[PDB]
PDB file of N, CA and C in Angstrom:
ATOM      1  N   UNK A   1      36.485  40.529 -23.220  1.00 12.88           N
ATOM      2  CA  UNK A   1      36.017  39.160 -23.050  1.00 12.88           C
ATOM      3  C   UNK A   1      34.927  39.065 -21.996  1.00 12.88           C
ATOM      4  N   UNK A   2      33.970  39.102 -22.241  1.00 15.29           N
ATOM      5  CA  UNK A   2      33.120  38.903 -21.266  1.00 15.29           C
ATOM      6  C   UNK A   2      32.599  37.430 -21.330  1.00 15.29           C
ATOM      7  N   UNK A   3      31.577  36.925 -19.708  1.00  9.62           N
ATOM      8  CA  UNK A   3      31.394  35.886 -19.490  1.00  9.62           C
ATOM      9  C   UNK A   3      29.989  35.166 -20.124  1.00  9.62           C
ATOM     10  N   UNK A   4      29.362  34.385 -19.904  1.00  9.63           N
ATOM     11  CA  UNK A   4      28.308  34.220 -20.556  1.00  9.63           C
ATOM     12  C   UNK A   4      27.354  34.466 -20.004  1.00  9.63           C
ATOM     13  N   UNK A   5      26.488  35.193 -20.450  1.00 11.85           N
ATOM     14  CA  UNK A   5      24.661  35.203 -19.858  1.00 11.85           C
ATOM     15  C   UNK A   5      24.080  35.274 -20.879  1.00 11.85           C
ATOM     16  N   UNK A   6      22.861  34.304 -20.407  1.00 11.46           N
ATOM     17  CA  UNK A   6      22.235  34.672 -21.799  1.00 11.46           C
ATOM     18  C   UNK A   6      20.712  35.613 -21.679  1.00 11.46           C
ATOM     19  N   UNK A   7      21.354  36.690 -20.497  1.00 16.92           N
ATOM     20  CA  UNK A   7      20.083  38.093 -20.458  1.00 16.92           C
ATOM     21  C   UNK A   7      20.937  39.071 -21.145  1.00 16.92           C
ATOM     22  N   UNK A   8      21.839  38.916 -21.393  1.00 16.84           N
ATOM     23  CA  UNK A   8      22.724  39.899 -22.683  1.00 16.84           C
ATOM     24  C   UNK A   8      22.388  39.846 -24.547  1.00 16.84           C
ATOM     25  N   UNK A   9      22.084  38.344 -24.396  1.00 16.12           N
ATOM     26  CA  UNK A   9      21.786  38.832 -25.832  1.00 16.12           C
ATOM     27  C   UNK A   9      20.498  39.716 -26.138  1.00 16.12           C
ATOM     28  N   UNK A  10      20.449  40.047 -27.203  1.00 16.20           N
ATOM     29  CA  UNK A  10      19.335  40.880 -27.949  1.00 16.20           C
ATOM     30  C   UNK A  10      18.920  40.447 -29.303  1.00 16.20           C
ATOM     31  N   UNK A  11      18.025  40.471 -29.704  1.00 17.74           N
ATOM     32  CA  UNK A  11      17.766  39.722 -30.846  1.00 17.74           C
ATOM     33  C   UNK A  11      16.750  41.044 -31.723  1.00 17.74           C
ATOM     34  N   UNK A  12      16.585  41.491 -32.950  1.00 14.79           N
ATOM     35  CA  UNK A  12      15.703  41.947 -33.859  1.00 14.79           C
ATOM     36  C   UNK A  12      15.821  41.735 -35.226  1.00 14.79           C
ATOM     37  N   UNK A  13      15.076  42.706 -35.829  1.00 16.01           N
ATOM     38  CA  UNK A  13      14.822  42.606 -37.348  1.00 16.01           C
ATOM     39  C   UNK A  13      13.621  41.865 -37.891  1.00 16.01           C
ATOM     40  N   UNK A  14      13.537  42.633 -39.115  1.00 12.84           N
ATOM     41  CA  UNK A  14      11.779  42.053 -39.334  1.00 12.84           C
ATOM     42  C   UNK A  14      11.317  40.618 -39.558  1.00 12.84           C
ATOM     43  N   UNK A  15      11.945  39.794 -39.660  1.00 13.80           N
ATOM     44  CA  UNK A  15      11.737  38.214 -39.962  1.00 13.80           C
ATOM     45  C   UNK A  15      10.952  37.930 -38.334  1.00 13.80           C
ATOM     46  N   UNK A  16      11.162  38.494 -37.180  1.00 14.05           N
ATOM     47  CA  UNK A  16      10.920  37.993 -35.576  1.00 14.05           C
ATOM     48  C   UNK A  16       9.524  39.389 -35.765  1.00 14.05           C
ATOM     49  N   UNK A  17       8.951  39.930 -36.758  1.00 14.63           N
ATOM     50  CA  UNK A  17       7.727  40.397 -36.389  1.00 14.63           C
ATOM     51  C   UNK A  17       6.837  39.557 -37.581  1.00 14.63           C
ATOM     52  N   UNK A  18       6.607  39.723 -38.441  1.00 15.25           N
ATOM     53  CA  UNK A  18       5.765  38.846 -39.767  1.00 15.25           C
ATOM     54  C   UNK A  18       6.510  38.301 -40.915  1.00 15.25           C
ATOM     55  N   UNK A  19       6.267  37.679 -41.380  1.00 17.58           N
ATOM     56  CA  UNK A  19       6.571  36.507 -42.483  1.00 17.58           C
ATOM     57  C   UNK A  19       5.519  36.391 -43.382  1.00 17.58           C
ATOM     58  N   UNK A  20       5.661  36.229 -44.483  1.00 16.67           N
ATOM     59  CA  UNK A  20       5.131  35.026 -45.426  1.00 16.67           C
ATOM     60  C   UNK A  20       5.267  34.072 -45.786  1.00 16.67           C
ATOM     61  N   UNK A  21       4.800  33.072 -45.994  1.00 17.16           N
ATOM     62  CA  UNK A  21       5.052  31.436 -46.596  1.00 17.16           C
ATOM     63  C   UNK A  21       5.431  31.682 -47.516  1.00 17.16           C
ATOM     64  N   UNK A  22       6.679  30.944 -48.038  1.00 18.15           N
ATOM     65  CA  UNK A  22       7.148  30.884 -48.827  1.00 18.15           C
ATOM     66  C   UNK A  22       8.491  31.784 -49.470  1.00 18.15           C
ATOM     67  N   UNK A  23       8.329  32.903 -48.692  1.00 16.02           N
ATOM     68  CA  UNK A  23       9.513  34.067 -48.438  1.00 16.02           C
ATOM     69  C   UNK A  23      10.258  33.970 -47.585  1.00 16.02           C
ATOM     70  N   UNK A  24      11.824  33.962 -47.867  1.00 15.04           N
ATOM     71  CA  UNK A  24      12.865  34.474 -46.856  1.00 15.04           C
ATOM     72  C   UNK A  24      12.664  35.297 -45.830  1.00 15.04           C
ATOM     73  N   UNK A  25      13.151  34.756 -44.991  1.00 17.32           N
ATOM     74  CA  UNK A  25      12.612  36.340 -43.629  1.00 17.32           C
ATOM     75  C   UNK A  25      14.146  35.922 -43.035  1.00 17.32           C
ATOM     76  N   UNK A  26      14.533  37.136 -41.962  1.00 16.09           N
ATOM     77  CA  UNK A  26      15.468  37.446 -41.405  1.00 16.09           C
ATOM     78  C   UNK A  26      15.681  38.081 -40.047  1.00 16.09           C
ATOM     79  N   UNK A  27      16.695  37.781 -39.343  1.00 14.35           N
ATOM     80  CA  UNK A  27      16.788  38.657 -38.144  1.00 14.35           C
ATOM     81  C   UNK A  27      17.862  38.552 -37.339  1.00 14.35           C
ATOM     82  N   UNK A  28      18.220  39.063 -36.571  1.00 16.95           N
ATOM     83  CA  UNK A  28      19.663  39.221 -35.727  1.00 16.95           C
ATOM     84  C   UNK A  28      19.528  38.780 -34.513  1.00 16.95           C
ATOM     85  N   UNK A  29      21.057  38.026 -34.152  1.00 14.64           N
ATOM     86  CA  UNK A  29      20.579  37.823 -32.856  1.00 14.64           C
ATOM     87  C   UNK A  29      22.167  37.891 -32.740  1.00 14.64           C
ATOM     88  N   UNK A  30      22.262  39.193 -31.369  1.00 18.11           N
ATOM     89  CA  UNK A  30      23.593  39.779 -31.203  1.00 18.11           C
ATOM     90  C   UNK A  30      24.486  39.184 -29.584  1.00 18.11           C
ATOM     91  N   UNK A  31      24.983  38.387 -30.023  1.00 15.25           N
ATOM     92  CA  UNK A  31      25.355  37.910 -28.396  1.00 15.25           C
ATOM     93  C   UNK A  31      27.187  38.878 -27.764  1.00 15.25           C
ATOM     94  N   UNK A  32      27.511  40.126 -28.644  1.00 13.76           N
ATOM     95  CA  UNK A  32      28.713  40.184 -28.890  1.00 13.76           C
ATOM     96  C   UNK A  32      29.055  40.667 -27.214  1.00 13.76           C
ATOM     97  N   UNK A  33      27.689  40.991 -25.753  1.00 13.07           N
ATOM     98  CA  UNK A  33      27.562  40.786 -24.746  1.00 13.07           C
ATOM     99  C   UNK A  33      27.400  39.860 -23.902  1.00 13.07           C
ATOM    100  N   UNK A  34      26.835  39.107 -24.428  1.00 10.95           N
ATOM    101  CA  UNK A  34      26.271  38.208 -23.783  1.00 10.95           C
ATOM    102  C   UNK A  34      27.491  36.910 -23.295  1.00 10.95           C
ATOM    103  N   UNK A  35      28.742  36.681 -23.511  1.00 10.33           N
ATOM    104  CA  UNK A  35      29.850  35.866 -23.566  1.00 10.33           C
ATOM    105  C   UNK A  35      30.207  34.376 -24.598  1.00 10.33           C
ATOM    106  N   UNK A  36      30.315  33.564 -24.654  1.00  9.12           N
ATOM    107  CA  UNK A  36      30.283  32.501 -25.553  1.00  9.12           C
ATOM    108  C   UNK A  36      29.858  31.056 -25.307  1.00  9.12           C
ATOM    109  N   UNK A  37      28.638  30.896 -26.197  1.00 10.89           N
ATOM    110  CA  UNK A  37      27.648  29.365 -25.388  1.00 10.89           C
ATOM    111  C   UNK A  37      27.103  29.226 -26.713  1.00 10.89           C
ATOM    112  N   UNK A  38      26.507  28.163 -27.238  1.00 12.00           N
ATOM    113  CA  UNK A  38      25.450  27.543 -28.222  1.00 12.00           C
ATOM    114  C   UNK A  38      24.503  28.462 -28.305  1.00 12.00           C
ATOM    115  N   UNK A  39      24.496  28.509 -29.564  1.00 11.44           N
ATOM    116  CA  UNK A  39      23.395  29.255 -29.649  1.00 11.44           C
ATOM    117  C   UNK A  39      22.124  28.063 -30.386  1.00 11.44           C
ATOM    118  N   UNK A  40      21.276  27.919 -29.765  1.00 12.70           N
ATOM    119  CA  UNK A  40      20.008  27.486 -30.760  1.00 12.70           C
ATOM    120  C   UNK A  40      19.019  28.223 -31.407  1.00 12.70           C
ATOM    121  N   UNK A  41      18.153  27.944 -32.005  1.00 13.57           N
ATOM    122  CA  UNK A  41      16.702  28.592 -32.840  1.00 13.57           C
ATOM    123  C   UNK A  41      16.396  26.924 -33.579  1.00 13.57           C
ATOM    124  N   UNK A  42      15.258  27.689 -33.079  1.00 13.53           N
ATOM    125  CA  UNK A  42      14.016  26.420 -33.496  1.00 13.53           C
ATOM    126  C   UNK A  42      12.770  27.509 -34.021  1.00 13.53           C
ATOM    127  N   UNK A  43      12.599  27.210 -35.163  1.00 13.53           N
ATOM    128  CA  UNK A  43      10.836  28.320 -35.787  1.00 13.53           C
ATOM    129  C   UNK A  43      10.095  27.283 -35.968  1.00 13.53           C
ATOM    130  N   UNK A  44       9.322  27.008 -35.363  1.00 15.03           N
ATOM    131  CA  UNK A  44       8.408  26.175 -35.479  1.00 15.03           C
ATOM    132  C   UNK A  44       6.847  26.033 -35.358  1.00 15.03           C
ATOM    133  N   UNK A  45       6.488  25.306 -36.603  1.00 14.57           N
ATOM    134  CA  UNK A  45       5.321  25.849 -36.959  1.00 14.57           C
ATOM    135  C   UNK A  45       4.539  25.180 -36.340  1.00 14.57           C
ATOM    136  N   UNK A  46       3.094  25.557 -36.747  1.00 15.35           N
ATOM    137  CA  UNK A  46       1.545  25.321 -35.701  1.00 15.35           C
ATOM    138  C   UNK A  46       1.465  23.723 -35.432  1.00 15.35           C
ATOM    139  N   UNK A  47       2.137  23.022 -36.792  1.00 10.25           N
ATOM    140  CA  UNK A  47       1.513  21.534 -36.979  1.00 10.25           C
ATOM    141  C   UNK A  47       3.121  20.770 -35.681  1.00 10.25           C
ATOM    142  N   UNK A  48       3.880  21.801 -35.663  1.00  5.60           N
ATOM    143  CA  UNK A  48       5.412  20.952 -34.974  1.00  5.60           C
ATOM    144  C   UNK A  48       6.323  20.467 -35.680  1.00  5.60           C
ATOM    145  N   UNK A  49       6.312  21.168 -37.127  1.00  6.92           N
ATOM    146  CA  UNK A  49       7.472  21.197 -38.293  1.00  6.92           C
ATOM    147  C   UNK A  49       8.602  22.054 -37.927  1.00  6.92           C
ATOM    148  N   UNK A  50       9.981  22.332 -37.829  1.00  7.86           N
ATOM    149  CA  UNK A  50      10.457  22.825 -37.692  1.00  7.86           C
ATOM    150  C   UNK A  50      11.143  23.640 -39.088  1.00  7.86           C
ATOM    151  N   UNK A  51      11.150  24.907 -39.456  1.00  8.07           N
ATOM    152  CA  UNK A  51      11.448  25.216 -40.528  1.00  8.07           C
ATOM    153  C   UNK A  51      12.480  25.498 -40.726  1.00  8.07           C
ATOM    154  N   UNK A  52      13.188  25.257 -42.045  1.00 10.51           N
ATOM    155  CA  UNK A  52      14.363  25.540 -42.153  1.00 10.51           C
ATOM    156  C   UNK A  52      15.106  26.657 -42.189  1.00 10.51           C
ATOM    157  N   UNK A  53      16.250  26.871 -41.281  1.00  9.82           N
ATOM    158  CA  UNK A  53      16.738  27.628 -40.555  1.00  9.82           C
ATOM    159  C   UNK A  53      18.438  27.739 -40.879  1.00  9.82           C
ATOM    160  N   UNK A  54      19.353  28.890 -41.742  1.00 11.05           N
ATOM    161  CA  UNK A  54      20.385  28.875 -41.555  1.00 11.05           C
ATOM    162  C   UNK A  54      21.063  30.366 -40.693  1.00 11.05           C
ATOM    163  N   UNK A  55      22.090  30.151 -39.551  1.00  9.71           N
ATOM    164  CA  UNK A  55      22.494  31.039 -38.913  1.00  9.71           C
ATOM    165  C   UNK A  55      23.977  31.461 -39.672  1.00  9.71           C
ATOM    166  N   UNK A  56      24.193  32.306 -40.022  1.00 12.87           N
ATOM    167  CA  UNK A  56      25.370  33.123 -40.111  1.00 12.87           C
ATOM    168  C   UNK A  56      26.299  34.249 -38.963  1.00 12.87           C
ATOM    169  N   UNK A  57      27.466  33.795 -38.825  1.00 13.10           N
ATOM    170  CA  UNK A  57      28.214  34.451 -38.246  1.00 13.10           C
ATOM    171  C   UNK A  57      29.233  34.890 -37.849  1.00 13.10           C
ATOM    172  N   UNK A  58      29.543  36.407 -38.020  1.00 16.12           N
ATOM    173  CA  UNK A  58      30.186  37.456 -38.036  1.00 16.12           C
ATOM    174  C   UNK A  58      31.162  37.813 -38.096  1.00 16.12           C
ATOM    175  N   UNK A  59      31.522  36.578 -36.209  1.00 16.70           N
ATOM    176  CA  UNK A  59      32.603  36.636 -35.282  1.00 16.70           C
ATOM    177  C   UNK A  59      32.893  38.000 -34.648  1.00 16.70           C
ATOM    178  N   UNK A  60      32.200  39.083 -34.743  1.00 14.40           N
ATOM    179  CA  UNK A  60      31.950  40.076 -33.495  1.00 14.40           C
ATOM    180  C   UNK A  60      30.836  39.666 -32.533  1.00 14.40           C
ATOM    181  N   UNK A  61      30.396  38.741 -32.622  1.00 13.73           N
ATOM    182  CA  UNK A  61      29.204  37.749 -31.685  1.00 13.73           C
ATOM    183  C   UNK A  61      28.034  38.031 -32.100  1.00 13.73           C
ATOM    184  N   UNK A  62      27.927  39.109 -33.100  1.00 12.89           N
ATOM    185  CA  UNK A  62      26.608  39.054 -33.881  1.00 12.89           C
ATOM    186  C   UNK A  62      26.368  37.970 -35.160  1.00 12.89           C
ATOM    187  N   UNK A  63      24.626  37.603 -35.282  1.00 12.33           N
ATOM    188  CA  UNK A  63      24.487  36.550 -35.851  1.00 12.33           C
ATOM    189  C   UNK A  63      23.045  37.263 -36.828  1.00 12.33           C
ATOM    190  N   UNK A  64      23.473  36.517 -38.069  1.00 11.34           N
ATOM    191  CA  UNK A  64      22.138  36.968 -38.895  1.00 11.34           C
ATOM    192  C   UNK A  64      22.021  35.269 -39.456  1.00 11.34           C
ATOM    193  N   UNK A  65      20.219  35.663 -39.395  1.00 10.67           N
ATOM    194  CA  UNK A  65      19.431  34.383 -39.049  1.00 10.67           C
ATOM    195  C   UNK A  65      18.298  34.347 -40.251  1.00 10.67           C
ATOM    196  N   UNK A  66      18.415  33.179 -40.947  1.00 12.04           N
ATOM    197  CA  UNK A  66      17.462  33.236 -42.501  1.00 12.04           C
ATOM    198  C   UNK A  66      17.037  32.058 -42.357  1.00 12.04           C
ATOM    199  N   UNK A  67      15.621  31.894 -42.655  1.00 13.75           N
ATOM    200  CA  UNK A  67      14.784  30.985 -42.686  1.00 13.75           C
ATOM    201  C   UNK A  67      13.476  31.276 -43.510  1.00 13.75           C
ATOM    202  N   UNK A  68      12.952  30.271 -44.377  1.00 11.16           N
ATOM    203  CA  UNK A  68      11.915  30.159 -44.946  1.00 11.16           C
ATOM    204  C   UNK A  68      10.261  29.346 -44.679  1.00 11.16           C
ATOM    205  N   UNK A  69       9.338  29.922 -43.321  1.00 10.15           N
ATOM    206  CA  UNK A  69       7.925  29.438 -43.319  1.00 10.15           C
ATOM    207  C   UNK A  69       7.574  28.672 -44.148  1.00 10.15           C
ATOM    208  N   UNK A  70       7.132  27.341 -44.688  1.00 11.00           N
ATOM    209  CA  UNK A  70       6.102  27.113 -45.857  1.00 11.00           C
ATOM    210  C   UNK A  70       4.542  27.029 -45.484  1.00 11.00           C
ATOM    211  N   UNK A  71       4.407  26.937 -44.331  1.00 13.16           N
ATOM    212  CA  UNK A  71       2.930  26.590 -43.919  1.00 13.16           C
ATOM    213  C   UNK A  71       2.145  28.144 -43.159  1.00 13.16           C
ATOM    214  N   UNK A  72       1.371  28.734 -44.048  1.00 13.04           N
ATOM    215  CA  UNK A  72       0.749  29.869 -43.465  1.00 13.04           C
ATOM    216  C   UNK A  72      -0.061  29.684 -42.037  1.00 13.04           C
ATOM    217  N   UNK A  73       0.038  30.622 -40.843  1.00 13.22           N
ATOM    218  CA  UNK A  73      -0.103  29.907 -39.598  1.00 13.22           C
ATOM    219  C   UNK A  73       0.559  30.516 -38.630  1.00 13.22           C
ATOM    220  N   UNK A  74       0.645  30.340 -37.346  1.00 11.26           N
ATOM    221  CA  UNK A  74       1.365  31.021 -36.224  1.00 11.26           C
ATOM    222  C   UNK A  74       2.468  30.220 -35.756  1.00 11.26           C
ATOM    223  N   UNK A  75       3.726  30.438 -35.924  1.00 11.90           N
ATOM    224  CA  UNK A  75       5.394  29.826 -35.688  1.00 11.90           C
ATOM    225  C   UNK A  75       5.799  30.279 -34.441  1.00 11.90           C
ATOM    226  N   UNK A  76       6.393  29.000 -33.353  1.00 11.15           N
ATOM    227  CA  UNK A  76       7.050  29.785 -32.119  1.00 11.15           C
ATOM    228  C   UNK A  76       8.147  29.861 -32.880  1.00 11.15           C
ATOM    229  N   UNK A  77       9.296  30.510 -32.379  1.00 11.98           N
ATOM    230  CA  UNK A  77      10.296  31.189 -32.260  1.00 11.98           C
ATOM    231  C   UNK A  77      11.006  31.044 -30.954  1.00 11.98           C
ATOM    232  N   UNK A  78      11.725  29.954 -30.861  1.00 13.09           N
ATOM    233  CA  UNK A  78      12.372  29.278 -30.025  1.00 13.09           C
ATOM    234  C   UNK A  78      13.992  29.911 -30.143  1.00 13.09           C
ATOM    235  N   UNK A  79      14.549  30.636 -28.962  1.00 14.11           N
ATOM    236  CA  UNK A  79      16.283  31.533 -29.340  1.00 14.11           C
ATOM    237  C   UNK A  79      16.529  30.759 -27.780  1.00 14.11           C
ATOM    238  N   UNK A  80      17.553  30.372 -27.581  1.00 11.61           N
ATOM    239  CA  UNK A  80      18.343  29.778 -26.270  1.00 11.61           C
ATOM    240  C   UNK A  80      19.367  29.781 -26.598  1.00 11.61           C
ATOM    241  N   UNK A  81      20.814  30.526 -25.514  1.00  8.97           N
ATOM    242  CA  UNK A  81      21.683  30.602 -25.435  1.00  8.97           C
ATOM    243  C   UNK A  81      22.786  29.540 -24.561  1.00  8.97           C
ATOM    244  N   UNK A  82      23.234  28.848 -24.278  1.00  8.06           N
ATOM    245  CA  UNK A  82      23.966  27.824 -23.336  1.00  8.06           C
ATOM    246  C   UNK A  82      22.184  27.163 -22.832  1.00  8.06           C
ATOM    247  N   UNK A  83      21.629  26.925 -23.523  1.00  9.51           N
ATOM    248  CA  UNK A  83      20.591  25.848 -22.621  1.00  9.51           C
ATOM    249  C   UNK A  83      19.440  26.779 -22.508  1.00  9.51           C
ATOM    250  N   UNK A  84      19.808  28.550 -22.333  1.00 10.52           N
ATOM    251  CA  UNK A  84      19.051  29.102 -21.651  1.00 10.52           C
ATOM    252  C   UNK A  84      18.214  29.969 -22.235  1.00 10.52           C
ATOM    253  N   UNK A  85      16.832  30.158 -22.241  1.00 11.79           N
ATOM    254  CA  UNK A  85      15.685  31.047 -23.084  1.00 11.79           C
ATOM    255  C   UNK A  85      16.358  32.509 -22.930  1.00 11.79           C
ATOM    256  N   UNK A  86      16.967  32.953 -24.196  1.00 11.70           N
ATOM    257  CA  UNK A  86      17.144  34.180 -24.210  1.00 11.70           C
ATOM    258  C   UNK A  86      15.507  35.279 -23.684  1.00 11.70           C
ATOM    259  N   UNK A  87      16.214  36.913 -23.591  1.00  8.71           N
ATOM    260  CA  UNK A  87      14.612  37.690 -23.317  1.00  8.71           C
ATOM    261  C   UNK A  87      14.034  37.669 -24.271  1.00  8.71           C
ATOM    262  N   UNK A  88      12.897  38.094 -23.855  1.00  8.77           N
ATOM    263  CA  UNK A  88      11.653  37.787 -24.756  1.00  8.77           C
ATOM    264  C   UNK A  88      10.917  37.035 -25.718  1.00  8.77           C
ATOM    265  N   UNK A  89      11.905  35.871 -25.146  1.00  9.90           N
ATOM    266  CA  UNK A  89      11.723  34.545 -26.020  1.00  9.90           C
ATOM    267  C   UNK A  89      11.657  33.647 -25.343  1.00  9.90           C
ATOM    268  N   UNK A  90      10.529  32.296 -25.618  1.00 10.02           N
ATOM    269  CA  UNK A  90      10.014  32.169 -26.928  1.00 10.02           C
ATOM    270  C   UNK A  90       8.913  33.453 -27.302  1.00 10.02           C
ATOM    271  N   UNK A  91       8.686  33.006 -28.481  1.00  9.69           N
ATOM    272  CA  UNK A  91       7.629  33.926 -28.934  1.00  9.69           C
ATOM    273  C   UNK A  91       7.037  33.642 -30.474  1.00  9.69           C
ATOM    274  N   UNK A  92       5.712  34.626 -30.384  1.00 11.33           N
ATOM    275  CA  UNK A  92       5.094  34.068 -31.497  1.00 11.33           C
ATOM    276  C   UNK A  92       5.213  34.632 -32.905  1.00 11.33           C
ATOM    277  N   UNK A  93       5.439  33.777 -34.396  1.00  7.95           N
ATOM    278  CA  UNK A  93       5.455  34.473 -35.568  1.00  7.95           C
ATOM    279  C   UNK A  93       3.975  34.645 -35.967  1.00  7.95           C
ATOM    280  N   UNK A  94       3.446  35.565 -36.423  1.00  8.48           N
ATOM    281  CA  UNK A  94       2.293  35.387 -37.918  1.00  8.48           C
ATOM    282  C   UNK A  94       3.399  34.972 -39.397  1.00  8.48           C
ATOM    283  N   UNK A  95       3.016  33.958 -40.102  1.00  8.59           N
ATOM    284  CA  UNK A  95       2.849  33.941 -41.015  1.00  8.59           C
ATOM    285  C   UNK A  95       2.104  33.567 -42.008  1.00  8.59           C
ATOM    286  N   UNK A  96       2.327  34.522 -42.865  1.00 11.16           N
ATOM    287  CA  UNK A  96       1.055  35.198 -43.654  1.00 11.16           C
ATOM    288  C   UNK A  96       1.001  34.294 -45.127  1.00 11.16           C
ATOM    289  N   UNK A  97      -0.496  33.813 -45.533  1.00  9.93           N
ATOM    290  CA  UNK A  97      -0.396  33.426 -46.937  1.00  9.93           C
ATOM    291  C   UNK A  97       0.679  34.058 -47.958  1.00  9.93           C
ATOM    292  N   UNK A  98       1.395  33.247 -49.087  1.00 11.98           N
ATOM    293  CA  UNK A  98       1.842  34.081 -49.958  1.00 11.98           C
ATOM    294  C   UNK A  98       1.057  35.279 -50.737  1.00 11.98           C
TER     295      UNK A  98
END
C-alpha cells in the first residue's frame, strides 16, 4: 500500500508520441506506485476542444487510455494526479492529417 505522489506515476505508449485525426490512439498511465488520488487527462486541441477521452482500469493501478483527435494540429496532453501535474506533463501531441 503505498501513499500518494504523483512523481510516481509514469505514463507511455504510442498515442503520447503521434496521432492521426480521426484514428484511435492509446497509452498508459501506471500509478500502481504512485498511491491512490483522481486521476485526470484532458487532450486538448489547438482551437480548446477537448477530445474524447475513455480511461480503463486494471485495478493493479495501471490505466490504459483511448482517445480519438478529429482536428489535425498540435494537442496538449494534460495527466494530473490528486490535483497534481504528473512528470513530464503537460505536453505536446502532433496530430497528423488522416
Amino acid at each position: 500500500m503505498d501513499p500518494f505522489d504523483a512523481s510516481k506515476v509514469k505514463c507511455s505508449g504510442p498515442g503520447l508520441e503521434r496521432a492521426t485525426a480521426g484514428e484511435v490512439g492509446q497509452f498508459q498511465v501506471d500509478c500502481s506506485s504512485a498511491g491512490s488520488a483522481e486521476l485526470t487527462i484532458e487532450i486538448c486541441s489547438e482551437a480548446g476542444l477537448p477530445a474524447e477521452v475513455y480511461i480503463q482500469d486494471h485495478g493493479d493501478g495501471t490505466h490504459t487510455i483511448t482517445y480519438i483527435p478529429l482536428c489535425p494540429g498540435a494537442y496538449t496532453v494534460t495527466i494530473k494526479y490528486g490535483g497534481q501535474p504528473v512528470p513530464n506533463f503537460p505536453s505536446k501531441l502532433q496530430v497528423e492529417p488522416a
